[PDB]
Amino acid sequence: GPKFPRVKNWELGSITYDTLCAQSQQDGPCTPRRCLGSLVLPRPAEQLLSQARDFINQYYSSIKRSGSQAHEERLQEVEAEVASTGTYHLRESELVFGAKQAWRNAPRCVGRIQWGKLQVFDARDCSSAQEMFTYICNHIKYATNRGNLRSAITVFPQRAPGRGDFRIWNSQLVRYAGYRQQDGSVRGDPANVEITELCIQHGWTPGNGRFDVLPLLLQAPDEAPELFVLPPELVLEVPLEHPTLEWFAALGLRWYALPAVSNMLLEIGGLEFSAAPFSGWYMSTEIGTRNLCDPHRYNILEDVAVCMDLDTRTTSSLWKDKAAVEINLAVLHSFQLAKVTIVDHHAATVSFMKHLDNEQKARGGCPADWAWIVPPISGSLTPVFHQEMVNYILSPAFRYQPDPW
Amino acid sequence: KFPRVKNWELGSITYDTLCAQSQQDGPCTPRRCLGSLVLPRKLPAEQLLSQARDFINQYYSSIKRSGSQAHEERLQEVEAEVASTGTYHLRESELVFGAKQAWRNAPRCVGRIQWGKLQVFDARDCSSAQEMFTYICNHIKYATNRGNLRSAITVFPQRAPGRGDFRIWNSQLVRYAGYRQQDGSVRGDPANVEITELCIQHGWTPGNGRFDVLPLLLQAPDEAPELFVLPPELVLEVPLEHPTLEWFAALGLRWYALPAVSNMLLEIGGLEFSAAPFSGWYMSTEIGTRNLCDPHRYNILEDVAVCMDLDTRTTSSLWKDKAAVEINLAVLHSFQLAKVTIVDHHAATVSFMKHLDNEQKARGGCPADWAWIVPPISGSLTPVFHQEMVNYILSPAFRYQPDPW
Ligand code: HEM
Numbered sequence: 114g115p116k117f118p119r120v121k122n123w124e125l126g127s128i129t130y131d132t133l134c135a136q137s138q139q140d141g142p143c144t145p146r147r148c149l150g151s152l153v154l155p156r157p158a159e160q161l162l163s164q165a166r167d168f169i170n171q172y173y174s175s176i177k178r179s180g181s182q183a184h185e186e187r188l189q190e191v192e193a194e195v196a197s198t199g200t201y202h203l204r205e206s207e208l209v210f211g212a213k214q215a216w217r218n219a220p221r222c223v224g225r226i227q228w229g230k231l232q233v234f235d236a237r238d239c240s241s242a243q244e245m246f247t248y249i250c251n252h253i254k255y256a257t258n259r260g261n262l263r264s265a266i267t268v269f270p271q272r273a274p275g276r277g278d279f280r281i282w283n284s285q286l287v288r289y290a291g292y293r294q295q296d297g298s299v300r301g302d303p304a305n306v307e308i309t310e311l312c313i314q315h316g317w318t319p320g321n322g323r324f325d326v327l328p329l330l331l332q333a334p335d336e337a338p339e340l341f342v343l344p345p346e347l348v349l350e351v352p353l354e355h356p357t358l359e360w361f362a363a364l365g366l367r368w369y370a371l372p373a374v375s376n377m378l379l380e381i382g383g384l385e386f387s388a389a390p391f392s393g394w395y396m397s398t399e400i401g402t403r404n405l406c407d408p409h410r411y412n413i414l415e416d417v418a419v420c421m422d423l424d425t426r427t428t429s430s431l432w433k434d435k436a437a438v439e440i441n442l443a444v445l446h447s448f449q450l451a452k453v454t455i456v457d458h459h460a461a462t463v464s465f466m467k468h469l470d471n472e473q474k475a476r477g478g479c480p481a482d483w484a485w486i487v488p489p490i491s492g493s494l495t496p497v498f499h500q501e502m503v504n505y506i507l508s509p510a511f512r513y514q515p516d517p518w
Numbered sequence: 519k520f521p522r523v524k525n526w527e528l529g530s531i532t533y534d535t536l537c538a539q540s541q542q543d544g545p546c547t548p549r550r551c552l553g554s555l556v557l558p559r560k561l562p563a564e565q566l567l568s569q570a571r572d573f574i575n576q577y578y579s580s581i582k583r584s585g586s587q588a589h590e591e592r593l594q595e596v597e598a599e600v601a602s603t604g605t606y607h608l609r610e611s612e613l614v615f616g617a618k619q620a621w622r623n624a625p626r627c628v629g630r631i632q633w634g635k636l637q638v639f640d641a642r643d644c645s646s647a648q649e650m651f652t653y654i655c656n657h658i659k660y661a662t663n664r665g666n667l668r669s670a671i672t673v674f675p676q677r678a679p680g681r682g683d684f685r686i687w688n689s690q691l692v693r694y695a696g697y698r699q700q701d702g703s704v705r706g707d708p709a710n711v712e713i714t715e716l717c718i719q720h721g722w723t724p725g726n727g728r729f730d731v732l733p734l735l736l737q738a739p740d741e742a743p744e745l746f747v748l749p750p751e752l753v754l755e756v757p758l759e760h761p762t763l764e765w766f767a768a769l770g771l772r773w774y775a776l777p778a779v780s781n782m783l784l785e786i787g788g789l790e791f792s793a794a795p796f797s798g799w800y801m802s803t804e805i806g807t808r809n810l811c812d813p814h815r816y817n818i819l820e821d822v823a824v825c826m827d828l829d830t831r832t833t834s835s836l837w838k839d840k841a842a843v844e845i846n847l848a849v850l851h852s853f854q855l856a857k858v859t860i861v862d863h864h865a866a867t868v869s870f871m872k873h874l875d876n877e878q879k880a881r882g883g884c885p886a887d888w889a890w891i892v893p894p895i896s897g898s899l900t901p902v903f904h905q906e907m908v909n910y911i912l913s914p915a916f917r918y919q920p921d922p923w
């Protein structure tokens with residue numbers, strides 16, 4: 114057969130060959146001696162220029178003018194810019210294309226059926242932390258759209274030789290505080306203990322609840338970060354109730370509506386956008402299984418299981434699994450009632466299967482990280498469990514970047 | 519560079535230095551990770567000789583006698599035999615140690631905390647399919663033990679350059695028939711349709727239910743396989759019921775007690791054992807989730823859901839999740855009622871965590887395949903989901919081999 118990875122689906126018995134993987138330049142963490150697929154994060158004029166040429170070529174293909182005079186004029190303008198300034202700048206439509214392409218390229222994202230629908234706010238004129246805040250508020254208002262969520266990214270100025278970076282210090286735009294107690298336990302979200310304490314060092318007055326929304330810490334070039342409080346009314350939340358277990362509402366659980374990732378770097382054509390927050394909508398398992406049930410997060414499984422009167426003394430009762438299911442249903446049910454967009458892990462995975470097919474035909478493959486794409490409950494009940502996947506890095510890309518502090 | 523392996527739940531870090539001992543490439547390269555692939559892509563005396571020396575070294579080192587006269591002389595024996603004949607033979611105690619190590623080294627196996635407790639039956643004096651059967655029946659009887667299951671392996675004669683392999687054509691010693699319909703659908707276990715047809719074609723009189731136990735097709739070298747019906751009394755089965763849903767029993771479901779894999783090749787010291795069936799006990803999700811709920815297996819989710827009166831018309835009621843849970847619960851209950859060994863996925867993954875830790879101290883690492891270790895429901899509910907793992911090939915090993923027809 115073909116000299117490209119053979120990819121098999123064991124539910125349906127179908128085979129494809131990924132040819133797109135040939136376009137990867139960036140090495141991942143695996144070698145023939147050993148596989149590092151399950152690690153979460155394993156560890157220049159002509160270099161820029163060659164990434165930029167590639168990216169310009171990708172742009173020109175996407176609008177089908179590849180080889181054209183407009184294409185070769187653009188290449189020359191990019192090399193002239195780099196020639197004299199060490200960097201270059203994207204046209205507005207190049208930024209839009211490349212922000213969508215970074216999403217399309219993200220191997221860990223099961224939401225990619227939607228990749229073509231992204232509102233790109235171009236905030237590359239922003240020159241202060243105060244203005245970042247206005248741009249972020251606008252982003253939140255647009256994206257939240259009273260519950261009918263709309264995917265969006267706001268792109269602040271690119272990294273620039275010897276000026277400091279734009280950075281949003283928080284990992285998401287909405288995060289609940291995590292307060293380290295005297296006994297060493299945590300009130301609120303343990304994932305956010307460090308950002309929480311950073312907010313306090315920078316002058317935030319802390320509350321003492323389990324669902325306290327954090328302020329944002331925004332950093333403009335060569336300045337100390339500054340602290341901004343989201344107006345409450347911009348932060349849509351859904352209190353959690355269960356469709357038949359009446360007591361579930363009494364637990365006083367809630368989640369925010371808008372997942373908006375704020376600490377990743379968007380790389381396009383070798384240019385680096387260090388502040389570039391993006392939002393879509395939640396898959397229900399992110400809230401109901403990971404955020405509420407991870408032992409190192411809210412850790413609520415036992416409390417729910419006790420309310421359900423389950424046998425928590427023995428694993429073989431499947432207490433954990435029954436409680437998790439009900440917690441997931443409550444999340445789906447509560448978001449539905451509140452009219453806030455959300456997708457269940459069955460509907461999400463089916464649509465990702467459809468994405469896979471569309472990409473097979475459009476590009477000859479799709480990079481995907483099976484461990485992240487298969488949901489954290491009910492794995493083999495989703496079609497993605499049964500689908501082999503090839504993981505590789507393409508650019509444009511969203512990448513992790515070191516914390517600013 | 520050796521891998522750093524982080525547990526995200528506990529924040530603890532180890533380094534895997536055992537991967538340095540891998541002399542066998544897996545499917546990945548720096549350009550693309552193929553970890554999620556089920557089968558490998560690719561499926562002289564000097565070479566046999568170093569695998570042999572190496573394996574002989576592992577053995578002497580294991581009984582604490584490295585360097586001893588017994589050690590040097592055994593190396594001479596192996597060497598003289600290879601140089602003269604192109605092959606060699608193992609001593610019983612070497613074979614026992616080798617088989618245990620192959621199990622130890624199996625990256626896909628969550629049950630490895632048991633790796634030291636393996637009954638090894640030497641069947642290398644076997645010369646006919648009729649004798650293979652007698653050995654297999656003994657194995658089943660030993661391993662079943664009236665429900666108090668005991669791990670075992672029976673090793674038939676090695677591959678020899680001159681000749682055909684000893685082979686068990688069935689994939690397990692117990693398999694339910696799968697009868698294809700003229701309208702392409704399947705009765706019984708769709709996984710077993712080819713072997714079912716092979717059996718009829720070699721003269722088996724078929725049945726027509728959903729749980730008909732297959733005869734074995736056993737093949738001595740360079741001969742047609744022969745059919746052998748297992749005495750019903752050797753095949754312990756468990757009827758499935760639910761502790762509280764009275765109607766579940768009416769589904770008429772059952773499963774066999776004894777999982778015994780019979781188509782993998784066992785490789786020790788460069789020698790290859792094409793027939794080496796091995797058995798332990800089930801982890802409940804293997805029956806409950808995969809075998810009964812996979813869409814391409816018995817596929818009973820819908821029937822169970824209808825019985826539970828769930829809303830089947832929309833994914834977001836989590837009907838599938840709810841039914842799967844009750845099904846896994848029925849398996850555990852029914853195995854416990856029949857006094858038949860089984861382990862749930864919570865206890866199993868907890869034991870494997872302990873195994874990882876034992877191996878870290880004993881060997882500096884543990885090859886493991888994350889996609890296969892994390893169970894097919896309630897993944898993030900088990901500690902293994904949160905554990906990084908490094909997959910690689912050590913020998914002695916259990917490998918796949920081609921189907922013999
Ligand atoms: C439209 C609805 C969307 C859904 C339901 C969705 C769903 C998801 C989910 C469940 C994850 C895994 C999250 C985790 O375990 O922490 C994810 C990862 C990701 N998605 Fe999406 N996605 C959506 C839209 C977006 C958009 C709009 C972007 C960017 C423009 C995006 C980029 C990402 C990236 C970069 C990751 C990986 C993050 C990392 O590696 O840590 N997705 N997606």
Ligand code: HEM
Binds near residue numbers: 626671800
């Ligand atoms: C004692 C209880 C044992 C348990 C509960 C157990 C559990 C399992 C499970 C659940 C799997 C995954 C199977 C699948 O999804 O199809 C597996 C794979 C495996 N285990 Fe075990 N194991 C046990 C003992 C053994 C023994 C005795 C051997 C060999 C001597 C063994 C060798 C294997 C091998 C080779 C695989 C990989 C099969 C493949 O790659 O297709 N295990 N183990």
Ligand SMILES: N=C(Nc1ccc(CCNCc2cccc(NC(=N)c3cccs3)c2)cc1)c1cccs1
Binds near residue numbers: 154372373392393
């Ligand atoms: N915790 C660490 N790292 C870490 C890295 C990655 C992640 C996962 C980030 N996931 C958040 C996320 C990302 C992308 C999408 C979602 N969910 C969504 N539905 C969307 C968000 C935005 C658009 S859709 C959530 C968590 C911790 C550390 C390492 C060393 C010190 S701390």
Ligand SMILES: N=C(Nc1ccc(CCNCc2cccc(NC(=N)c3cccs3)c2)cc1)c1cccs1
Binds near residue numbers: 629796798919
């Ligand atoms: N069918 C193929 N491949 C294939 C690969 C893997 C599997 C899954 C094998 N798993 C069965 C199994 C293995 C190991 C353990 C268990 N379960 C157990 N608890 C134990 C069995 C023995 C001791 S413990 C089940 C099925 C088909 C092909 C061969 C050639 C071309 S396609």
Ligand SMILES: C[C@H](O)[C@H](O)[C@H]1CNc2nc(N)[nH]c(=O)c2N1
Binds near residue numbers: 152153484904
């Ligand atoms: C070790 C392992 O990679 C880690 O726990 C992963 C597994 N899969 C995941 N999948 C998603 N979607 N999100 C995650 O945080 C993780 N965690």
Ligand SMILES: C[C@H](O)[C@H](O)[C@H]1CNc2nc(N)[nH]c(=O)c2N1
Binds near residue numbers: 123498499502556891
């Ligand atoms: C594509 C994917 O690798 C395939 O469905 C795997 C996933 N994990 C598995 N895990 C186990 N334990 N057994 C399996 O058969 C599989 N199948």
Ligand SMILES: [Zn+2]
Binds near residue numbers: 143
């Ligand atoms: Zn890999």
